[PDB]
Write an enzyme that holds these catalytic residues in place. Structure first.
Site, PDB file in Angstrom:
ATOM      1  N   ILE A  32       0.868  -1.212   0.000  1.00  0.00           N
ATOM      2  CA  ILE A  32       0.000   0.000   0.000  1.00  0.00           C
ATOM      3  C   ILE A  32       0.891   1.244   0.000  1.00  0.00           C
ATOM      4  CG2 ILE A  32      -0.336   0.543   2.450  1.00  0.00           C
ATOM      5  CD1 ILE A  32      -2.919   0.102  -0.424  1.00  0.00           C
ATOM      6  N   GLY A  33       2.138   1.094  -0.417  1.00  0.00           N
ATOM      7  CA  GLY A  33       3.086   2.219  -0.408  1.00  0.00           C
ATOM      8  C   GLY A  33       2.858   3.192  -1.545  1.00  0.00           C
ATOM      9  N   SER A  34       2.740   4.477  -1.222  1.00  0.00           N
ATOM     10  CA  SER A  34       2.525   5.525  -2.244  1.00  0.00           C
ATOM     11  C   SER A  34       3.137   6.832  -1.742  1.00  0.00           C
ATOM     12  CB  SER A  34       1.076   5.647  -2.553  1.00  0.00           C
ATOM     13  OG  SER A  34       0.606   4.470  -3.189  1.00  0.00           O
ATOM     14  N   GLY A  35       4.451   6.834  -1.503  1.00  0.00           N
ATOM     15  CA  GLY A  35       5.142   8.079  -1.110  1.00  0.00           C
ATOM     16  C   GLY A  35       5.616   8.138   0.329  1.00  0.00           C
ATOM     17  N   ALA A  36       5.155   7.238   1.186  1.00  0.00           N
ATOM     18  CA  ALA A  36       5.542   7.354   2.607  1.00  0.00           C
ATOM     19  C   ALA A  36       6.988   6.886   2.761  1.00  0.00           C
ATOM     20  CB  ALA A  36       4.600   6.558   3.464  1.00  0.00           C
ATOM     21  N   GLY A  67       8.055   4.949   4.322  1.00  0.00           N
ATOM     22  CA  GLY A  67       8.054   3.520   4.666  1.00  0.00           C
ATOM     23  C   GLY A  67       7.305   2.662   3.680  1.00  0.00           C
ATOM     24  N   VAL A  95       4.918  -0.111   3.568  1.00  0.00           N
ATOM     25  CA  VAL A  95       4.025  -0.834   4.460  1.00  0.00           C
ATOM     26  C   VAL A  95       3.028  -1.612   3.614  1.00  0.00           C
ATOM     27  CG1 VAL A  95       4.274   1.113   6.007  1.00  0.00           C
ATOM     28  CG2 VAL A  95       2.135   0.781   4.798  1.00  0.00           C
ATOM     29  N   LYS A 103       4.213  -2.479   8.848  1.00  0.00           N
ATOM     30  CA  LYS A 103       5.382  -1.787   8.326  1.00  0.00           C
ATOM     31  C   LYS A 103       6.649  -2.547   8.689  1.00  0.00           C
ATOM     32  CE  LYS A 103       6.182   2.520   9.654  1.00  0.00           C
ATOM     33  NZ  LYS A 103       6.702   3.465  10.684  1.00  0.00           N
ATOM     34  N   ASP A 124       6.215  19.075  11.051  1.00  0.00           N
ATOM     35  CA  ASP A 124       6.291  18.390   9.766  1.00  0.00           C
ATOM     36  C   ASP A 124       4.931  17.849   9.353  1.00  0.00           C
ATOM     37  OD1 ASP A 124       7.762  17.810   7.509  1.00  0.00           O
ATOM     38  OD2 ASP A 124       8.371  15.817   8.194  1.00  0.00           O
TER      39      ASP A 124
END
Ligand SMILES: *[C@H]1[C@H](C(=O)Nc2cccc(C(=O)Nc3ccc(Nc4nccc(-c5cccnc5)n4)c(C)c3)c2)C(=O)CC[C@@]1(C)C(=O)OC
Length: 354
Positions: free
Chosen positions: A25-29, A31, A33, A48, A144
């Site tokens: 499900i990773g899209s820019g983080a 991490g 995950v 994660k 942040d």
């Protein structure tokens, strides 16, 4: 043994068998995950893999603070830790840590893409403020906050992923990420920060929802600064006095801008306009943006005052806002660095006692 492994998700994720159907499900983080379903707990969960937490001093400090803070915070608008585990049993060969948390459908950036309404917009802002205020109660300032840092469920329940930048930033080591689109003037002008800095970030996020794009898109460190004064306006004399001289000059030297008014910066046309109430709630929204997007932080609205603002006060429930303050267990020295091997042992012990 009591762990099973999968190579899907670009690495060999090892996990307990209660979590299955692991999918990326990773899209820019920062991490990578993956999503999962727990049999023991009916709810589907997100996992994660923390790659090499002790790889350097910077990686460990981020991981150690995240684990201790996630474990000692209980809030609806802040992500919580369901379980932490490591496949390895030996400290000597200990290499990786897995984090499971409540799975959410999407991040705030995706939700911003869908044009929303005042009731849903006000609710997202109300929750974001409660999470920040809950963080400030424990002495935590984020600095942040960004739409890729905010996760939402389909019922519009908002949660915050990371705990910000700790103590200190435009040039940070590989564990961290530098996002300037939502940073305050003080952090970009070295003036110093107090709790109201996070109020500035939400103002850029709130305006981004309405406008549909980044309010201040700066290609570099100082193009960011030019965009802020270009629309908000050139600061007033009392503010520029306290800046340190090497940067006070750049401010006094740059071309002066009168700045646009919020009325034309955020006109009613983009907002819902058929209803008078929709126009009125827009009037409540623009004034709030006027009171948080203020360069002088000393005259900027506080987190507490924003919660009782007419735009936000309708959702005021003390359970979310007036929640019991969070206490951190081994934070006394949470402002200090140590040996990588010692860094390695502490992270193992924070995961091995739960
Ligand atoms: C926003 C936007 C963008 O690229 N976002 C985006 C595009 C495509 C897909 C996704 C996405 O997968 N979102 C997503 C899906 C699932 C979850 N669930 C979840 N639950 C809990 C925890 C986590 C998680 C933890 C750590 C790390 N990652 C996830 N996930 C989530 C949270 C999110 C997102 C754009 O295209 C424009 C660029 C961008 C990033 C933006 O902010 O521009 C201003």
């Amino acid at each position: 043994n009591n762990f099973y492994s999968v190579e899907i998700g670009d690495s060999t994720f090892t996990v307990l068998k209660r979590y299955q159907n692991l999918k990326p499900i990773g899209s820019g983080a920062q991490g990578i995950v993956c999503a999962a379903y727990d049999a023991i707990l009916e709810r589907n969960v997100a996992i994660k893999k923390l790659s090499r937490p002790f790889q350097n001093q910077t990686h460990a400090k981020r991981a150690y603070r995240e684990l201790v803070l996630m474990k000692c915070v209980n809030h609806k608008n802040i992500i919580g830790l369901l379980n932490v585990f490591t496949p390895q049993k030996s400290l000597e060969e200990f290499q990786d840590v897995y984090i499971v948390m409540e799975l959410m459908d999407a991040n705030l950036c995706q939700v911003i893409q869908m044009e929303l309404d005042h009731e849903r917009m006000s609710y997202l802002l109300y929750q974001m403020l409660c999470g920040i205020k809950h963080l400030h109660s424990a002495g935590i300032i984020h600095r942040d906050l960004k739409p890729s840092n905010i996760v939402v469920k389909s019922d519009c329940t908002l949660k915050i992923l990371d705990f910000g930048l700790a103590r200190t930033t435009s040039f940070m080591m590989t564990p961290y990420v530098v996002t300037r689109y939502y940073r305050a003037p003080e952090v970009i002008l070295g003036m110093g920060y107090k709790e109201n800095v996070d109020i500035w970030s939400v103002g850029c996020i709130m305006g981004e929802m309405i406008k549909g794009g980044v309010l201040f898109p700066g290609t570099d460190h100082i193009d960011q600064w030019n965009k802020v004064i270009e629309q908000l306006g050139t600061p007033c004399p009392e503010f520029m006095k306290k800046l340190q001289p090497t940067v006070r000059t750049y401010v006094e030297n740059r071309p002066k801008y009168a700045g646009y008014s919020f009325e034309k910066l955020f006109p009613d046309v983009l907002f819902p306009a058929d209803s008078e109430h929709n126009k009125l709630k827009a009037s409540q929204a623009r004034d709030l943006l006027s009171k948080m997007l203020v360069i002088d932080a000393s005259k900027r609205i506080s987190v507490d005052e924003a919660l009782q603002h007419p735009y936000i006060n309708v959702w005021y429930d003390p359970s979310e806002a007036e929640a019991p303050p969070p206490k951190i267990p081994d934070k006394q020295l949470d402002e200090r660095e140590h040996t990588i091997e010692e860094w390695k042992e502490l992270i193992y012990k924070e995961v091995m006692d739960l």
